[PDB]
């Protein structure tokens, strides 16, 4: 009394137009975070000999920010080829660690500008400028290595494996086969905790704050603006929503909880990828948001430059 | 590296399944899906058990 | 009620050509591979190359690669093993096998099922 | 991969232990098969994975594994079992038989 139906799921008809585009896109964002992480980074070391107070979180960012643009190319090359990884277990392993810290830490030091910039008004205004630069440093030092921390496990179980049929070469994560549910779960559960849940909530109840004090005040509010507080907000969302909503879609389909067809393979294919392209502008922003908008940075580079 | 199936359920016994399904993928070749009526929710079978393997051919071959 | 029947063997003069023909009746074709194996005359077997029917995922071995080619009609139902270039040593009866891929998490199910009953190959002037 | 398969042939007789071995030079993870032939017939599959019996063949015929170390035994053979036994592996793409044991009549 068991009915035994079959389906069978055709090659993906346009999938090579998506990742041509994506390809494109992705060397644009190469470029750009490239060049503006380099000369945050540079302004920030050489202001320091003009008197500056230049700030610990905005250079570690920067290094960071500019770490993950470097692996693009690793990226693009494995993308073009229907994702394929032509290079070593080493290379991927290596490619996949640099990575992840790095984006890890990324998203941790904004979370940290933003208590900082609350603190440094309500909090750091009596405090002498060199135990606050202690601060800021053991602060630095405790965000990089819990990046390291959390990025170590899932970098342990990748294996580069060649499809037993297929004859074509992956790389991908293989988890003890007596519990996999437990773990693909779990570390999805960290991402969208460590990742969205817990940097966003911070920031923007912080930036609300900030957004509150400085709008009590006369002179500040005659010289800050309530807008770029906000758009700061917004561009986390805009950046980092969509990449975890199709994320968890994807979850929710291994999970079975979805019915499968091949119109889902098809949409959850196309949005995961789209949205791994845009969730990368945070390089490319970061940058020109906390630095290039800044009155000072810019008369600063002006004056360096020339 | 993206298919169907990312696991394998190996606590099935026939009489908590009530229709199977047999996906044919480009990635991860022939795979199998069951649909336990006890909660009504839908598991990826392990093809090792005696009957299913058995079963799944006797419905090809026919 | 599953018959695979093989044709095409016989004779072949040194750096000659020959096409085999593998036909299958009585299973879902598209859902399985075929593969084509050999045994030498007094030897034993020894496998050739196979291919997945409806998705053309072929592979060969280290002694006919570059010379052995497979195609897979799913319309006819019918796997075809062309040989080139069939140097004495290519003498044997081959043998066509079909398999179910069925998905295992570390490999892929590749034990012969059903064979069929051979086909003689010569390779002498 | 290069399989040894130990011993070249067997003398038994009906119903003594028989025991045929099989040695991987690389790792297979259980993707094994053990096959016999008549003289003049094809190959019958005997035993899939490494130790799942097919479906149709007598309960006799038993794989094991130990690592990389897979024994077919034949608990006591009968007259209608004596021919020639070989193991293939199907881990990696590229399939690889056994030289292959026969059994012989001891007399």
């Known amino acids: 009394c068991i009915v035994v139906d079959t389906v069978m799921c055709p090659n993906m008809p346009n999938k090579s137009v998506l990742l041509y585009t994506l390809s494109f896109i992705y060397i644009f964002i190469f470029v750009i975070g490239m060049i503006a992480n380099s000369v945050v980074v540079w302004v920030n070391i050489q202001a320091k000999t003009t008197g500056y107070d230049t700030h610990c979180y905005i250079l570690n960012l920067a290094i960071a920010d500019l770490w993950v643009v470097l692996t693009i190319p690793v990226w693009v090359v494995s993308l073009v080829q229907h994702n394929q990884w032509p290079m070593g277990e080493l290379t991927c392993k290596v490619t996949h660690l640099i990575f992840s810290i790095n984006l890890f830490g990324s998203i941790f030091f904004l979370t940290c500008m933003s208590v900082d910039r609350y603190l440094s008004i309500t909090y750091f205004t009596n405090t002498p400028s060199s135990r606050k630069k202690m601060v800021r440093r053991v602060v630095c030092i405790l965000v990089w290595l819990l990046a390291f921390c959390v990025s170590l496990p899932d970098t342990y179980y990748l294996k580069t494996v060649t499809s037993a049929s297929n004859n074509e070469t992956y790389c991908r994560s293989f988890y003890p086969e007596h519990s996999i549910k437990e773990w693909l779960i779990g570390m999805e559960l960290v991402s969208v905790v460590l990742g969205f849940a817990v940097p966003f909530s911070i920031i923007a109840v912080f930036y609300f704050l900030l957004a509150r004090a400085i709008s009590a005040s006369s002179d500040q509010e005659k010289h800050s603006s309530r807008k770029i507080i906000f758009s700061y907000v917004v561009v986390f969302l805009v950046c980092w929503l969509p990449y975890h909503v199709a994320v968890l879609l994807d979850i929710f389909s291994i999970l079975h909880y979805i019915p499968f067809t091949c119109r889902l393979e098809h949409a959850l294919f196309t949005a995961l990828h789209v949205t791994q392209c845009l969730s990368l502008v945070h390089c490319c922003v970061n940058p020109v948001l906390y630095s290039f908008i800044n009155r000072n940075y810019r008369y600063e580079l002006m004056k360096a430059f020339i | 590296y993206r298919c169907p199936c990312r696991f394998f359920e190996s606590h099935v016994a026939r009489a908590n399944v009530k229709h199977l399904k047999i996906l044919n993928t480009p990635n991860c070749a022939l795979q199998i899906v069951a649909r336990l009526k006890n909660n009504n929710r839908q598991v990826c079978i392990d093809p090792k058990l005696k009957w299913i393997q058995e079963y799944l051919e006797k419905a090809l071959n026919k | 009620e599953v018959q695979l029947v093989e044709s095409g063997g016989g004779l072949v003069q040194p750096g000659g050509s020959l096409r085999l023909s593998c036909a299958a009746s009585?299973?879902?074709?598209?859902?399985?591979?075929i593969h084509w194996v050999r045994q030498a005359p007094g030897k034993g077997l020894e496998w050739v190359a196979y291919?997945?029917?409806?998705?053309?995922?072929?592979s060969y071995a280290d002694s006919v690669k570059g010379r052995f080619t497979i195609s897979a009609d799913t319309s006819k139902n019918t796997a075809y093993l062309q040989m080139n270039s069939l140097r004495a040593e290519d003498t044997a009866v081959y043998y066509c096998?079909?398999?179910?891929?069925?998905?295992?998490?570390?490999?892929?199910?590749?034990?012969?099922?059903?064979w069929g009953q051979g086909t003689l190959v010569t390779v002498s002037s | 991969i290069q399989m040894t398969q130990s011993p070249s042939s067997l003398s038994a007789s009906v119903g003594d232990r028989v025991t045929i071995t099989c040695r991987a030079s690389?790792?297979?993870?259980?993707?094994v098969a053990w096959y016999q032939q008549k003289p003049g017939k094809a190959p019958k599959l005997l035993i899939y994975?490494?130790?799942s019996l097919y479906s149709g063949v007598p309960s006799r015929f038993s794989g094991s594994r130990s690592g990389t170390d897979f024994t077919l035994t034949i608990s006591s053979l009968q007259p209608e079992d004596f021919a020639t036994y070989y193991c293939?592996?199907?881990?990696?793409?590229?399939?690889?038989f056994g030289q292959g044991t026969k059994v012989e009549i001891k007399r």
């Open positions: 096998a079909r398999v179910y891929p069925w998905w295992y998490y570390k490999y892929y199910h590749g034990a012969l099922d059903y």
């Open positions: 009585g299973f879902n074709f598209s859902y399985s591979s």
């Open positions: 291919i997945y029917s409806s998705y053309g995922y072929t």
């Open positions: 690389q790792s297979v993870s259980s993707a």
């Open positions: 994975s490494a130790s």
């Open positions: 293939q592996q199907y881990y990696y793409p590229l399939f690889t």
